[PDB]
Amino acid sequence: RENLYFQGIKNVHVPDNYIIKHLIGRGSYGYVYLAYDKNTEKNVAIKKVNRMFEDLIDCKRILREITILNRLKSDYIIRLYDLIIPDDLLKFDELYIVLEIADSDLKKLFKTPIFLTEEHIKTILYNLLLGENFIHESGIIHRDLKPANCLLNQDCSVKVCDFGLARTIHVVTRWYRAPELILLQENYTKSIDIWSTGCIFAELLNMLQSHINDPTNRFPLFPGSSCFPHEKSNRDQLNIIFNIIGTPTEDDLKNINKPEVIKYIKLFPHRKPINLKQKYPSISDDGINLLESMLKFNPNKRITIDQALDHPYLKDVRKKKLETKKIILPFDDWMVLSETQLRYIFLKEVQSFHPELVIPSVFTIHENNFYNNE
Amino acid sequence: GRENLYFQGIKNVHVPDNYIIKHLIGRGSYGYVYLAYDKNTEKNVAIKKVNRMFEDLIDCKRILREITILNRLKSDYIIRLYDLIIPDDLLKFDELYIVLEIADSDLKKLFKTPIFLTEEHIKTILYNLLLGENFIHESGIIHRDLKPANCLLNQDCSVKVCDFGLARTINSHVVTRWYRAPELILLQENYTKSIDIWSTGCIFAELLNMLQSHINDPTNRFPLFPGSSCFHEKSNRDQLNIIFNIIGTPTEDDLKNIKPEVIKYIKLFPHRKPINLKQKYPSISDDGINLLESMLKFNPNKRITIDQALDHPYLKDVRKKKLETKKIILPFDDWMVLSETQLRYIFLKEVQSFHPELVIPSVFTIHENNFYNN
């Protein structure tokens, strides 16, 4: 009987310059490890994604995740430092993704036995909003903002990652999804990211000791969809949303076109919104207003990033002074891609980090169909 | 001056100079647990800080039960209590530092790790857990709250049980009900040590998820009966419902052991068949499936016993019969509602067992003759 090696460090095979230290936790599509890079004298995060081509939907999302990160350059966005050359260029079924390290992330933060001041909360929120503004002005809707992909440093700086679901302008966690996204509308805008921000803001507000003295009593605001094993999930999620912000008003339903959608919504019995000031009593009227404006059912009624950055609540932390090109992805987002095409693009992205890489000709024959504006 | 965040919370952990706090391990019962090094004995230990002790006297008495039981159990199968640190304020302490034997991991953590177990590992862990439960029961105790979080684990597959705060002598918070026997869900008073066997079946089911041939992606591992929500009458209904979804609704024979009102309640649940365990776990022999099946019996009398489980063909190759006790007496009677002043007295007497020179304040010692009688 072999000893158990709980962190799985032995499964992590990377070049000599990287010293694998320990398991950080779960990332999107794989596990993330702390490593020291001897060549650049810094700590990095190395994510191993396995079973890459088993599910081509996930595979394309992994590709989208790395192609976007490779093209965004901002202090508000996790840097992609390296894509490690696969041992087998023809048959690789895994990829090692090397990322800028952060001290923590919001998901981890909320589980820690520490408390935040209101200054911390405003600073984190303000930094998140700055990141989102950079994302949107780069022509991207993140579409899956959640505590797990808002990385955090000790100085409250925020770095966004995990762009696998992003739009050009498994049990899934639906707790941070806008109602219009839950209602399977294909007409939605960057305002879905503002909804997600409101959800994250609510959890940041749980970090005040005067609100919650016991860290184990901190919960997401809309935990409607089950953690455990599509229609029932979406229904349950909509249901908890309405429990918090009330059923939609007549003016809310006016903004929607499809009568099948309205009819479905009407099936939900009427209820009033809960009192947010009561839920978060240590927060000023302006703070409640900001949270309220982020969590509007009607996306046109939802506060914008510009407005939020201008909001009285954030006046004290705003740094107008210390504060963009639209990105072009090497594939069109509508194309369904074959495994052979996917393999080509992956290796091209690897080649951006390793120019001496010779991509096999069975893949390079696809070269004329991609990277048309690069 | 916005202070840097310090995510571990090592700052509020105040212990004598011989203990060097290294890092946060995670959540334990009623408090957070830290890895520490004891300079005096030159070994690593776990230190749990329990605070807000006397805010809720129900939790307070459970904390006391947890430490008094551990202090009186002596076994390689049971986490050792190494120290109870003297409070700074003998009169008004609202926190306690509890120093425990360190383990490498625990079953809850194991199930989240990116590693896989062989069948031999699984058999070995289960066998060791059963040995621990047998020692517990022979000591005159029903654990009553066995779950992966309190089954500690070392690399060699040795298992150490802890967290006896809900334990019974054999004569707010969101509560995890997923490992509770149906007669506990149904609030019956006449239950037996067989409730621990039900919990063991639940844990065994999650151990089986650790086989790569069952589940190749660690994120697809779930408890068997996740009925009660993560976020008292509704919870018990949902938990009982998921149990019947797995093992079917109870037969007429199952009900014979049972109050007419309770039987009337169970009948409200629409009839259903048990699922097929052989299909759910296709890599396990008929022996393993039989062991699991016989642990998860609705009727507690029909459940396999620990002796029968240790005799089972499934565990034959790991059994070390050759390597296989007094009933413990608690210093208070389980039934009595204790006042804060009485609770403080017993806490300090337990502290005194580790620190004989401690002088307990006279205002507490007046309660002497009511405790430690046996």
Mark which of A301, A323, A345 sits at the end of a domain: A323
Helices (H) and strands (E) in chain B, counts: 13, 10
Q: Label the pairing between strands B81-84 and A140-141.
A: unpaired
Mark which of B301, B324, B347 sits at the end of a domain: B324
DSSP code at position A77: B
CA distance A155 to chain B (A): 5
User: Going by C-beta distance under 8 Å and a sequence separation of 6 or more, which residues neighbour residue B256?
Assistant: none
Q: How far is CA A362 from CA A95, A359, B306, in A?
A: 20, 9, 60
Same-domain pairing of B236 and B93: no
Do A227 and B231 count as a contact with CB atoms less than 8 A apart? no
Same-domain pairing of A284 and A153: yes
Same-domain pairing of B367 and B296: no
Contact residues, chain B, for A11 at CB < 8 Å: 114-115
Q: How many domains does chain B have?
A: 2
Scanning chain B, the segments in alpha helix (DSSP H) are: 57-72, 107-112, 119-138, 182-185, 194-208, 233-247, 252-256, 260-267, 277-280, 286-295, 306-310, 340-354, 362-365
User: For tokens 């019995």, what's the residue?
Assistant: A269
Options A144, A193, A252, A310, the catalytic residue: A144
Same-domain pairing of B119 and B242: yes
CA B132, CA B143: separation in Å to the nearest integer?
Answer: 11
Contact residues, chain B, for A6 at CB < 8 Å: 104-105, 109-110, 113, 115, 155
Contact A362, A90 (CB under 8 A): yes
Experimental technique, in short, is X-ray
Mark which of B324, B343, B358 sits at the end of a domain: B324
CA distance B1 to chain A (A): 10
Q: How many CB atoms within 10 Å of residue B352?
A: 15
Query: Closest Cα to residue B157, out of B315, B322, B326, B325?
Result: B315
Helix-helix angle A285-294:A191-205, to 10 degrees: 140
**H or E stretch covering B98:** strand B96-101
Same-domain pairing of B229 and B259: yes
Contact B34, B26 (CB under 8 A): no
In single-letter form, the type of residue at position A110 comes to F
**H or E stretch covering A35:** strand A30-37
CA A341, CA A369: separation in Å to the nearest integer?
Answer: 9
Nearest to A8 among B6, B8, B113 (CB): B113
Q: How many CB atoms within 10 Å of residue A236?
A: 16
Backbone φ and ψ of B68, nearest 5°: -70, -40
Contact residues, chain B, for A5 at CB < 8 Å: 115, 155
Query: Closest Cα to residue B65, out of B35, B98, B32, B88?
Result: B98
Q: What is the DSSP string of A326-347?
A: PP--SS-TT----HHHHHHHHH
User: For tokens 């008073």, what's the residue?
Assistant: B189
Same-domain pairing of B176 and B270: yes
In single-letter form, the type of residue at position B298 comes to F
Structure tokens at A297: 């059912």
CA B211 to chain centre: 24
CA B120 to chain centre: 24
With b for 16 or more beta-carbon neighbours within 10 A and e for fewer, the A325-358 pattern comes to eebebbbeeeeebeeebbbbbbbbbbebeeeeee
Same-domain pairing of A226 and A134: yes
Helix-helix angle B286-295:B194-208, to 10 degrees: 140
CA B359, CA A45: separation in Å to the nearest integer?
Answer: 52
CA B140, CA B171: separation in Å to the nearest integer?
Answer: 8
CA A298, CA B189: separation in Å to the nearest integer?
Answer: 52
Contact A10, B155 (CB under 8 A): no
Same-domain pairing of B124 and B207: yes
What CATH number is associated with residue B223? Answer: 1.10.510.10
Nearest to B157 among A4, A103, A152 (CB): A4
Backbone φ and ψ of B265, nearest 5°: -70, -45
Do A119 and B9 count as a contact with CB atoms less than 8 A apart? no
Strand, helix or coil for residue B322: helix
* CA-based nearest residue in chain B for residue A105: B7
Do B5 and A156 count as a contact with CB atoms less than 8 A apart? yes
Query: Closest Cα to residue A220, out of A241, A236, A235?
Result: A241
Beta bridge partners of A97: A47, A83
DSSP code at position A190: T
CA A136, CA A160: separation in Å to the nearest integer?
Answer: 12
Helix-helix angle B119-138:B194-208, to 10 degrees: 170
Nearest to A3 among B7, B109, B155 (CB): B155
Same-domain pairing of A316 and A335: no
Do A154 and B32 count as a contact with CB atoms less than 8 A apart? no
Give me the domain span that covers residue B257.
105-324
Catalytic center residues of B: 145
Q: What is the DSSP string of A275-331?
A: -HHHHSTTS-HHHHHHHHHHS-SSTTTSPPHHHHHT-GGGTTT--TTT--PPP--SS
Structure tokens at A93: 């079924």
Contact B330, B303 (CB under 8 A): no
Same-domain pairing of A294 and A347: no
**H or E stretch covering A363:** helix A361-364
Contact B180, B235 (CB under 8 A): no
Same-domain pairing of A14 and A33: yes
Beta bridge partners of B50: B31, B96
With b for 16 or more beta-carbon neighbours within 10 A and e for fewer, the B176-187 pattern comes to bbbbbbbbbbbe
Sign for the CA dihedral angle at A160, A163, A165, A169 comes to positive
User: For tokens 């184990």, what's the residue?
Assistant: A216
Strand, helix or coil for residue A252: helix
Structure tokens at B87: 């409070």
CA A256, CA B332: separation in Å to the nearest integer?
Answer: 65
Q: How far is CA A10 from CA A30, A85, B286, in A?
A: 15, 19, 33
Measured in angstroms, the resolution is 2.0
What CATH number is associated with residue B353? Answer: 3.30.200.20
Same-domain pairing of B129 and B251: yes
Give the CA angle between residues B250, B254, B260 to the nearest 5°. Answer: 90
Nearest to A11 among B6, B114, B118 (CB): B114
Sign for the CA dihedral angle at A230, A235, A240, A246 comes to positive
